[PDB]
Amino acid sequence: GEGWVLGHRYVNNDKLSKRVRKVWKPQLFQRELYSEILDKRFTVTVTMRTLDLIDQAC
């Protein structure tokens, strides 16, 4: 629910005026974790905020 989200943009956020479609893409950063089951260090470029949920999923 992040990658490739294309919405619409307005000026005063109340529109009697023009509406122009705007593109939105998620932020990408590197997250290094360690899997003991697979015995492998993993690198995830995935969603930042999701990692905050993963930390609560442990």
Partner RNA sequence: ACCAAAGCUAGCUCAACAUAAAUAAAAUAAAACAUUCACCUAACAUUAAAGUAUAGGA
Partner RNA sequence: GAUUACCCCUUCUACCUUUUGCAUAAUGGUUUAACCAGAAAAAAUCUAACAAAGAGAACUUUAGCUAGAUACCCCGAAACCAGACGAGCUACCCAUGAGCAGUUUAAAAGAACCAACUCAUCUAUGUGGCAAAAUAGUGAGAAGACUUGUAGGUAGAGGUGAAAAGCCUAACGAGCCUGGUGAUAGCUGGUUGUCCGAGAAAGAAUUUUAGUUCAACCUUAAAAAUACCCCAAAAAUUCCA
Partner RNA sequence: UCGCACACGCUUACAUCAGUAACUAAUAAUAUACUGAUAAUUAACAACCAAUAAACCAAAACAACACUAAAACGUUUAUUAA
Partner RNA sequence: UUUACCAAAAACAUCACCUCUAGCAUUACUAGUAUUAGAGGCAAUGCCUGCCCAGUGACACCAGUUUAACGGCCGCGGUAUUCUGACCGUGCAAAGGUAGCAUAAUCACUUGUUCUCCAAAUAAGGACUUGUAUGAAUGGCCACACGAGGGUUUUACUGUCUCUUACUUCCAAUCAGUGAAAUUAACCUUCCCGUGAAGAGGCGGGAAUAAAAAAAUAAGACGAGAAGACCCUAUGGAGCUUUAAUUAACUAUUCCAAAAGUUAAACUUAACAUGGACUAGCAAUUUCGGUUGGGGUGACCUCGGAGUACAAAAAACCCUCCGAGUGAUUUUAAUCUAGACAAACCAGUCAAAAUAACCCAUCACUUAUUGAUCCAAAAU
Residues contributing to the site for RNA (CB under 7 A) = 4, 6, 9, 11-12, 15-29, 48
The CB-of-40 to RNA minimum distance in angstroms stands at 22
Question: Residue 35 burial by CB count (10 A; 0-12/13-18/19+): exposed, middle or buried?
Answer: exposed
Q: Which residue lies nearer to RNA by CB, 38 or 53? A: 53
Q: Which residue lies nearer to RNA by CB, 8 or 40? A: 8
Torsion of CA 6, 26, 46, 29, to 10 degrees: 160
The CB-of-35 to RNA minimum distance in angstroms stands at 20
Residue 35, beta-bridge partner list: 40
